[PDB]
Backbone:
């Protein structure tokens, strides 16, 4: 037999995010709506940033405001909230100092301390249940070196 | 770098199931077979039901009779048994009263007492060892409000 | 709501391993490294073997020599040592007699006495600290009936 | 049968924490709230630090301020307090001298005397009961050598 | 090193149970069976109830009738008997008056006198030895304020 | 509140060991080392055997030769010596007659006279102090009816 | 409605590879690049070989040397390393004996023990970061019977 396995990779020499255990971030996450409290469960994962130069600050921002949208009704939207390193991310660029990230906390140089990434969504109107259906959205997290 | 994390969610304003610790139910379970006793281990998890209205009864049923089937032989089947709240579930719809579920037992309104969910399988013929191989199946648990 | 829980199972009519309390073996284990003594902590669990026929001997072997490898450097390796029933396992097949396992020690037929399984790792060079990073590996324990 | 047990380990040649009995620290802890005194129970464990070089000081800090957050409401928070070696830990780095830790108190070189680790939480407003629900959080304890 | 310790807590502002020495109740108990008398040993622990309001009665009940079940045979069952405060608990709700509990017997307000909790099991048929194997079950004790 | 207490039990209809006061045997024991005499303290407990049939002999043996091993060095071992009923136990099976055990010495039928169980360890080389550290081991006592 | 689902299959009566859980191998894999260590993450999957005749040896080779190439610059290349069964694969043909594969380890005849497949890539010049961009490549694994 012949088995053609396609191998693909994306390379950025400067920066990237990886999980605290040394694995790539998940490509998809699942949220749960609970009717009693009218809110969605948050997704939390501990991430470490790998950098080529540890002396420069890190700028984190979102490419666009993420929104959960119904697969059958593009009109219905629900905002998505993303926070990294304990601060809420948005289109405006946040800045993290190199000393705050704690590079080389372990024996590996260029790897910072674990930073928590939180993904969550809320109804667009407070105290109102969202319309039934399946929702989907994309969070475009952009990280660049100072 | 840019990391496109896809966020998806399914919303039902009326009812749903969550674990007793406030987490979504597992998407996959594993059963073990012991050759000496010719039986499979059961999977048990404690679940709590969240409802928009606590005064209505709850109807629980299975969409279809689940069966473990060999991944390499669709002919070989093994029945799966599912029980929730201490009663055996089937295609015929069971009914649970609102008072039996014990809503608002804790300080959170609309959340009932913990109900145990049991997943298990048995050989289709009693006292006969199943054929060797890998088996798989899907349990489609359907819960609706009265 | 509909919740599609996938149920999967692997069946071998002859033999398998289970924990002494009647649970499946863990799918993952964690080792701890202490800088002071340059050695890793061992993982120990008490297991019982279930057999269809108690009169036959048991052959235990490893599919391949396990090694801890760095997730970021496939070149760096650390050997893993596995021992079951008080004897060191390897690629060469060990043999355990049916009388040594003590079948039906309790009231259940076909279940032997508790056998200890030990998982441990050591640096590839004695007296040298391993390179910092996260390591991973797989132990493929193979058990077959005589 | 074949049983694929995944073995993973994290190695830091310089420093780490272990329990006083020579076991890894627990990955999860449980706190208890008492309605009568409006306070949470503290978690206490005796830990020993293992070092490659016993002549250097030890710096202990938290990667971020831990907070207990409701699994269903990311808005509700409760601060977590962590203290090690009798001093309260925070984002600002504490320093412990090598003589204060008492290295080689027993016959093992590079192992210090037992240091107590305390994990506790309190309501964000004094004298006010927290909202009912399930809370979760992560404490990221960072220890590095001087 | 970085050590991510997960901290979790469950909060009910009204009521809860704690041990007489101020510790959380055990999450697991062990029963012993003696062949000579055909009965199981009882588990006894002294508990104190903490309440936000000491003037209201206390309702105690079980979410479902607990049963010991064989880990390898879901058909085999053994009933579990639970009694708190000297009275047998069941699905029907018991009621304890605020004066009978003796609140503030010591210097701490809102804490009652010690109440004994008894967990025990018996064979489903009197005078018959249970089938050999390992048994497990869950007791869901529900306590609410009047 | 809801408190999920897990109840588990192991049943053997034929035989078992219990303490002379009617309690289960301890799951863990502690040994002390005195530098002055290069020996370990022995652990002694008085046990009574409960049997379904008092006319049959009792066979007592160890599943494997117990050894104290260093938690940080699996190479270092220390033998453990176990004796029950005044005779040294080993892998080879001992036999105790029904008349020697003195069944029904008290008013309870099927319960024998008190038999002493001794657990002790010694250095693997006589007159040599063991290496410093923490040691652990498991004694697998197997008792079966004739 | 009419839904035209195209069904296609490739048949080789002699040999093929499947995952250890009985699924086809993935058609695409993703590699992660970390700037700090200047290396790519490896892809590891456990595979089992199915054969028509278990007495013949197995020859494994690559059709051509795989290389990661930039989608926008065909000049930029990065070598891909593939290893199966613990040995590095190349254009020269490796040979695996029928006894080393351990056929019929489980109850299914003609299925061998689990063999690990590793896919990884490295920069063409050691210690040099690859040029930024998206890379792609194909691994043509050829397996034939002796």
Residues:
């Amino acid at each position: 037999v012949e088995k053609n396995i396609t191998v693909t990779a994306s390379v950025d020499p400067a920066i990237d995010l990886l999980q605290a255990d040394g694995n790539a971030l998940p490509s998809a996450v699942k949220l749960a709506y609970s009717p009693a409290s009218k809110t969605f469960e948050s997704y939390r994962v501990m991430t470490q940033v790998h950098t080529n130069d540890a002396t420069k600050k890190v700028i984190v921002k979102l490419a666009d405001t993420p929104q959960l949208t119904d697969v059958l009704n593009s009109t219905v939207q629900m905002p998505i909230s993303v926070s990294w390193g304990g601060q809420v991310l948005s289109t405006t660029a946040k800045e993290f100092e190199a000393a705050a990230l704690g590079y080389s906390a372990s024996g590996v140089n260029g790897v910072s301390s674990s930073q928590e990434l939180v993904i969550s969504a809320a109804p667009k109107t407070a105290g109102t249940a969202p319309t039934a259906g399946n929702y989907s959205g994309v969070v475009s997290l952009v990280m660049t070196l100072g």
Q: What stands out?
A: Residues 1-146 of chain F form one domain. The two ends of chain F are 50 Å apart (CA to CA). Chain F has one domain: 1-146.
